[PDB]
Amino acid sequence: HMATLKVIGVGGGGNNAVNRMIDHGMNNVEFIAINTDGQALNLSKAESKIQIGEKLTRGLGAGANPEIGKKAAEESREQIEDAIQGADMVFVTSGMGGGTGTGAAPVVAKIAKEMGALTVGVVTRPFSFEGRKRQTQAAAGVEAMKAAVDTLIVIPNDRLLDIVDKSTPMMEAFKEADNVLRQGVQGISDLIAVSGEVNLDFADVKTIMSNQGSALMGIGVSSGENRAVEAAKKAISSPLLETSIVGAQGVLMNITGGESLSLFEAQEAADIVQDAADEDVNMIFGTVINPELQDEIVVTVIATGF
Ligand SMILES: Nc1nc2c(ncn2[C@@H]2O[C@H](COP(=O)(O)OP(=O)(O)O)[C@@H](O)[C@H]2O)c(=O)[nH]1
Numbered sequence: 001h002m003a004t005l006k007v008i009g010v011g012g013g014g015n016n017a018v019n020r021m022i023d024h025g026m027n028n029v030e031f032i033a034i035n036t037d038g039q040a041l042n043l044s045k046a047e048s049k050i051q052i053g054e055k056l057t058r059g060l061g062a063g064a065n066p067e068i069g070k071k072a073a074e075e076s077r078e079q080i081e082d083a084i085q086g087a088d089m090v091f092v093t094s095g096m097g098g099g100t101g102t103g104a105a106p107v108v109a110k111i112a113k114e115m116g117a118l119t120v121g122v123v124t125r126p127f128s129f130e131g132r133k134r135q136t137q138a139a140a141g142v143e144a145m146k147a148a149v150d151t152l153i154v155i156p157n158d159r160l161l162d163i164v165d166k167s168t169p170m171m172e173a174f175k176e177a178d179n180v181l182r183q184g185v186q187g188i189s190d191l192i193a194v195s196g197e198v199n200l201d202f203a204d205v206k207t208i209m210s211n212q213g214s215a216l217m218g219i220g221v222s223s224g225e226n227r228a229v230e231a232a233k234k235a236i237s238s239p240l241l242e243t244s245i246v247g248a249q250g251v252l253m254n255i256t257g258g259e260s261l262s263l264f265e266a267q268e269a270a271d272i273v274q275d276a277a278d279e280d281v282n283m284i285f286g287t288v289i290n291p292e293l294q295d296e297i298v299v300t301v302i303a304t305g306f
């Protein structure tokens with residue numbers, strides 16, 4: 001089995017994330033760009049582009065109206081279905097609070113889910129500086145997304161204000177939010193491609209992520225003394241995510257290390273994650289030994305079921 005992965009941007013912010021991922025370089029992933037705005041869509045780097053709602057919008061965006069995004073996606077339902085064909089896992093990425101993403105992303109997600117793809121949403125909430133109506137529209141979008149997806153990751157854009165100094169470029173801050181999605185997608189690609197010593201596969205991902213609600217996903221990288229604890233703590237920290245590790249009922253955890261990876265340090269790392277999560281956690285633990293590594297380890301945590 002070699003899972004077919006698709007990443008679907010919906011609306012401006014979603015397609016921004018897709019464009020920046022295509023620039024970064026991602027092999028064996030199909031990118032799909034969905035927008036009402038034909039001008040923006042023409043500039044996308046994606047090899048699959050779906051202009052939605054042209055009869056409704058005349059090729060403009062949705063003008064921040066979620067109803068127009070929803071109706072646009074419904075107008076173009078067949079074209080969305082065609083683009084998703086074959087997917088085993090779909091990431092739907094979108095900025096909540098505008099028109100196209102808020103309205104169309106839940107329609108796209110439901111199409112993917114009903115095609116049998118594991119459907120993961122990765123969405124932003126607006127900055128508080130964008131105001132109340134934007135935040136209220138976004139909240140309705142988040143709720144609609146939750147209904148439509150298997151698992152949802154929410155990045156409040158206000159969390160970016162916690163990781164910048166007064167001079168950090170806005171584009172550099174956006175790249176931090178992009179990395180949540182990128183690391184998730186790359187993590188799945190790695191799981192599918194690499195044989196673990198304690199091997200995890202796509203069925204494990206489905207067990208942890210299918211028909212859940214909110215999710216945390218995170219990676220931590222460290223070396224030297226206390227590397228296992230440090231990497232595990234970093235993985236669960238998730239400063240940009242709305243969802244925390246506390247109370248998680250399902251966890252997929254992997255440790256990748258060199259030949260030096262010790263049993264003791266695997267336990268230390270796993271204990272950090274366990275102590276943070278529910279009493280009845282269903283933890284699926286994996287390990288990869290990569291002999292090309294020296295002293296670095298990478299801990300990956302996906303947590304669901306709250
Ligand atoms: N982090 C991040 N947030 C974005 C970006 N673009 C837009 N946003 C957010 O996404 C929300 C919706 O904007 P947009 O996606 O352009 O609207 P739509 O095209 O009508 O779906 C905005 O209110 C912002 O909070 C981006 O590139 N990065």
Ligand SMILES: NC(=O)c1c(F)ccc(OCc2nc3cc(C(F)(F)F)cnc3s2)c1F
Pocket residue numbers: 120183184185186187188190191192193194195196197198199200201205217252253254286287288300302
């Ligand atoms: N132990 C393994 O088989 C193994 C591997 F070989 C390579 C990489 C591994 O872990 C990476 C993962 N990344 C994600 C990302 C996601 C998510 F949330 F969809 F982005 C879900 N599950 C995983 S598992 C492994 F668990």
Ligand SMILES: [Ca+2]
Pocket residue numbers: 190191192193194195196199200201
């Ligand atoms: Ca594997």
